[PDB]
Design a protein around this ligand. Structure first.
Ligand SMILES: *[C@@H]1O[C@H](COC2O[C@@H](C)[C@@H](O)[C@@H](O)[C@@H]2O)[C@@H](O[C@@H]2O[C@H](CO)[C@@H](O[C@@H]3O[C@H](CO[C@H]4O[C@H](CO)[C@@H](O)[C@H](O)[C@@H]4O[C@@H]4O[C@H](CO)[C@@H](O[C@@H]5O[C@H](CO)[C@H](O)[C@H](O)[C@H]5O)[C@H](O)[C@H]4NC(C)=O)[C@@H](O)[C@H](O[C@H]4O[C@H](CO)[C@@H](O)[C@H](O)[C@@H]4O[C@@H]4O[C@H](CO)[C@@H](O)[C@H](O)[C@H]4NC(C)=O)[C@@H]3O)[C@H](O)[C@H]2NC(C)=O)[C@H](O)[C@H]1NC(C)=O
Ligand SMILES: *[C@@H]1O[C@H](CO[C@@H]2O[C@@H](C)[C@@H](O)[C@@H](O)[C@@H]2O)[C@@H](O[C@@H]2O[C@H](CO)[C@@H](O[C@@H]3O[C@H](CO[C@H]4O[C@H](CO)[C@@H](O)[C@H](O)[C@@H]4O[C@@H]4O[C@H](CO)[C@@H](O[C@@H]5O[C@H](CO)[C@H](O)[C@H](O)[C@H]5O)[C@H](O)[C@H]4NC(C)=O)[C@@H](O)[C@H](O)[C@@H]3O)[C@H](O)[C@H]2NC(C)=O)[C@H](O)[C@H]1NC(C)=O
Lengths: 207, 214
């Protein structure tokens, strides 16, 4: 029988007004015998009718996949509204329903701290610039490193880790050639999170 | 979720913890875990092999009923430090009546060149000194394989108010992580010396420490 997964928008889409966040209902294991699928969408139980449902696509195991996509208002998602995908199929005695929303709980603002490389690291050709982001809830967050108004490529960020007070934390490591560091170039760790003013802050680091 | 649908047992085979393998005093175990075992058929049978030779030293623990009816069943095989670190292979064969055939899983040490971790302790940001508790960071990078243990201490005593990130794959194919120890600012300001302890197979004596203080 059909299976339904429901996917949330990307944090960067919800945190920036000029972008379009979307919720995505994906149905799989749709039969050749019953290929036809109907989507109803609700926002806090209020049905809405502007979802874009895509034509079904047979997968390489002879089963169909049907995707329906609902654009969401930023404020609605951030105010914790519930988004419900109801999936009707002749092979379903009752419609499948999945619901999602933002993580519930008192949102908490991240604290952002940039840490220079350890003196011990200075004897190598590349150094580590560290951005610690802690005390934030929910775990959804986007962290980016940039320099001279441009993104940096050689950085990796740990996934969020549940800290002892129920908030989350992570670290982002930027690797740069030591010479760029010694020369006094300025680096910035940018953070986006719902509980920040304007959903945004940045901290800078340099010698 | 008190009733029970299904489609055969599921087996996961876990390696010994880094700390048990890197210290001769401790006891490294390989653990074979079986979930989705049916109430109708709770009997599970394990066979263990080391490079194909059957061994009999394993100890299976009593079944564990989960919130669904399904049982969980665990078998634990203690391994020799040398065997694991020299790359001997451990097979767990799981037998059950809901299975059309025995499930086999194998595990062994990561092949691929070990790389020594670099350990860097990082003091709290100036900006964090406005707060009541401060963050002491230990960056451990450039290591392979990912199996690693990081702990904190001060003055001969463990310091356990920390969290450590999972290992993250870096862009050069090695791993890194960060460990954050939270201490009262007063203890930092008092000039107490804290120490990040790292255990990994590619380290001399499988052990190194880096200290951190005001
Ligand atoms: C026939 O083939 C089908 C397709 O493929 C294949 O065959 C060939 C082609 C192969 O080459 C290969 O491609 C395929 O094998 C098969 O389809 C399957 O069916 C699976 C089983 O149901 C299903 O697994 C679920 O996977 C989700 C995760 O999904 C996402 O990840 C997978 C893996 O990477 C992706 O494939 C998939 O596309 C999903 O990815 C996300 O898609 C979103 C929508 O597009 C993206 O978001 C949007 O992106 C746009 C971008 O333009 C925009 O940004 C929008 O804003 C945004 O919304 C998103 O970016 C993308 N993310 C990523 C990372 O890629 C899992 O979550 C599920 O796990 C849950 O259920 C299982 C049991 O079913 C359970 O064991 C788990 O524990 C999970 O349970 C939940 O648990 C959590 C906590 O753990 C709880 O919180 C929940 O309460 C609990 N809920 C439930 C209900 O239990 C599933 O494992 C596959 O995803 C699906 N594949 C595809 C392509 O659709 C099919 O099986 C085959 N049929 C047969 C008979 O063989
Ligand atoms: C029916 O319900 C069962 C039970 O599920 C859970 O129980 C129910 C009632 C709810 O409360 C659930 O929320 C709850 O999770 C369920 O069984 C689970 O099945 C899934 C597959 O569907 C298994 O998932 C996989 O997970 C793999 C990774 O799993 C480990 O890490 C998780 C944390 O993320 C733990 O929760 C697990 O218990 C497990 O822990 C590991 O355990 C091993 C051995 O015990 C440890 O190794 C040993 O550690 C000691 C330290 O004391 C020494 O160092 C030894 O040397 C060493 O060998 C290991 O350290 C530890 N790891 C950690 C991080 O703690 C993942 O890789 C797979 O991809 C997959 O996602 C899931 O693990 C399993 N749960 C358990 C507890 O086994 C059924 O699926 C349900 N069935 C249905 C139909 O609903």
């Amino acid at each position: 029988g059909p299976s339904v997964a429901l996917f949330p928008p990307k944090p960067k889409d919800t945190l920036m007004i000029s972008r379009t966040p979307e919720v995505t209902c994906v149905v799989v294991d749709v039969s050749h015998e019953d290929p036809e699928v109907k989507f109803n969408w609700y926002v806090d139980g209020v049905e809405v009718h502007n979802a874009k449902t895509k034509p079904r696509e047979e997968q390489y195991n002879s089963t169909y996949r049907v995707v329906s996509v609902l654009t969401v208002l930023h404020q609605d998602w951030l105010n914790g509204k519930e988004y419900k995908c109801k999936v009707s199929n002749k092979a379903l005695p009752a419609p499948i329903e999945k619901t999602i929303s933002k993580a519930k709980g008192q949102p908490r603002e991240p604290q952002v701290y940039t840490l220079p490389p350890s003196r011990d690291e200075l004897t190598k050709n590349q150094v580590s610039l560290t951005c610690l982001v802690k005390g934030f809830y929910p775990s959804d967050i986007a962290v980016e490193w940039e320099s001279n108004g441009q993104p940096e490529n050689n950085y990796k960020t740990t996934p969020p880790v549940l800290d002892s007070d129920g908030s989350f934390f992570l670290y982002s490591k930027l690797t740069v050639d030591k010479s760029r560091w010694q020369q006094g170039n300025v680096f910035s760790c940018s953070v986006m999170h719902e509980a920040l003013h304007n959903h945004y802050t940045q901290k800078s680091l340099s010698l």
